[PDB]
Amino acid sequence: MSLRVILFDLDGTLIDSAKDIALALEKTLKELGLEEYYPDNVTKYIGGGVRALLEKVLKDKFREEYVEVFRKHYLENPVVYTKPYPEIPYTLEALKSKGFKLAVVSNKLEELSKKILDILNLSGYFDLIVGGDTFGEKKPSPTPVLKTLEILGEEPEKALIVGDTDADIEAGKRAGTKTALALWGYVKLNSQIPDFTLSRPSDLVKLMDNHIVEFEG
């Protein structure tokens, strides 16, 4: 299978950010006096963006302006506990040296995505970092995948989308790309069937070693 470009979700795929999301949520509920809403398992709410997170956490108490509040607090501490998943740096290095173009596409705010990857020193691996706002937060799926690919000059059929959520896989399928599930992330059950299922990041590199995936000059 011949490919040229690999696009990664961020939270729960490249980075283990749940503790820093929890820290921002905490500061958010304190600001807003909504402490009793802090949930028992925050990682259950990670994946769909800050908006989806606050909507499931606050239910009837949700207000659109709270998104800005959360983001403000997350920006005051983008990296405290957050780290790349084990084998992430290794895996990016391997892919890039085989010649793949790499990009990040996620729901996280672009500014925050770039700040986090700078602090973790991963920015270098990526040809393009794309966040929920980059092409407009209101755009329907899979526009961000498509537009990222158009920027990179590459076709969908030559791209692989890696993410831990069924929504990542579903966007790959709408765009007509190949898809891979990242099982090391936050999602405990999945109903999408991707081309590939990865239990650890270095598994990407094994598929390359077996010529199961090859880089297309």
Side-chain angles (χ1 to χ4, degrees):
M1 184 181 295
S2 300
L3 290 164
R4 292 195 35 92
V5 57
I6 304 163
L7 314 190
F8 293 90
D9 196 349
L10 189 59
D11 298 311
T13 296
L14 295 168
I15 60 176
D16 190 347
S17 53
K19 292 183 156 39
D20 292 341
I21 286 163
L23 176 76
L25 185 50
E26 184 256 296
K27 292 186 208 166
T28 293
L29 299 181
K30 172 182 203 271
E31 185 172 317
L32 301 183
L34 281 170
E35 291 96 332
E36 44 280 357
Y37 287 86
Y38 190 95
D40 272 283
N41 184 3
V42 177
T43 78
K44 284 190 178 101
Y45 302 103
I46 296 185
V50 165
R51 195 181 180 253
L53 183 139
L54 297 180
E55 270 168 343
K56 305 181 200 250
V57 163
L58 288 183
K59 285 147 338 278
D60 73 311
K61 308 299 276 224
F62 175 76
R63 302 187 75 78
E64 305 287 347
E65 60 257 49
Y66 288 168
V67 178
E68 260 183 293
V69 180
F70 182 106
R71 289 179 161 156
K72 184 186 103 201
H73 288 302
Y74 199 170
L75 278 168
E76 37 193 63
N77 285 286
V79 173
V80 179
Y81 308 102
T82 284
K83 300 153 128 43
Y85 276 97
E87 314 191 332
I88 285 291
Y90 167 80
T91 302
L92 301 173
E93 168 65 13
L95 295 174
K96 202 187 182 29
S97 81
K98 161 89 188 295
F100 292 98
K101 278 169 192 172
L102 304 183
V104 176
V105 186
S106 87
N107 291 329
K108 190 189 293 300
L109 209 42
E110 182 191 305
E111 194 171 285
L112 189 53
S113 300
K114 297 180 152 171
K115 168 126 247 14
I116 284 171
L117 295 164
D118 282 351
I119 284 163
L120 295 172
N121 203 233
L122 301 173
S123 291
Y125 288 112
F126 297 109
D127 300 69
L128 188 57
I129 300 157
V130 169
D133 59 324
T134 301
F135 299 118
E137 292 214 22
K138 24 160 142 164
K139 300 277 172 79
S141 179
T143 37
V145 177
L146 298 173
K147 282 152 140 170
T148 303
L149 289 166
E150 300 165 10
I151 291 161
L152 294 179
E154 303 290 351
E155 321 202 276
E157 75 190 305
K158 306 298 185 316
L160 185 59
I161 280 208
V162 185
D164 70 324
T165 86
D166 282 342
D168 301 338
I169 307 300
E170 183 187 348
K173 299 185 157 166
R174 287 190 185 278
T177 72
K178 304 313 194 285
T179 57
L181 263 177
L183 304 174
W184 63 86
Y186 295 128
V187 179
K188 273 176 121 161
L189 303 158
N190 281 285
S191 60
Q192 286 276 334
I193 316 137
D195 299 294
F196 297 115
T197 291
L198 314 173
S199 65
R200 37 193 60 191
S202 69
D203 287 6
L204 263 187
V205 179
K206 201 159 211 185
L207 292 186
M208 191 158 333
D209 288 357
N210 269 235
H211 289 1
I212 286 163
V213 311
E214 328 183 61
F215 167 71
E216 192 186 286

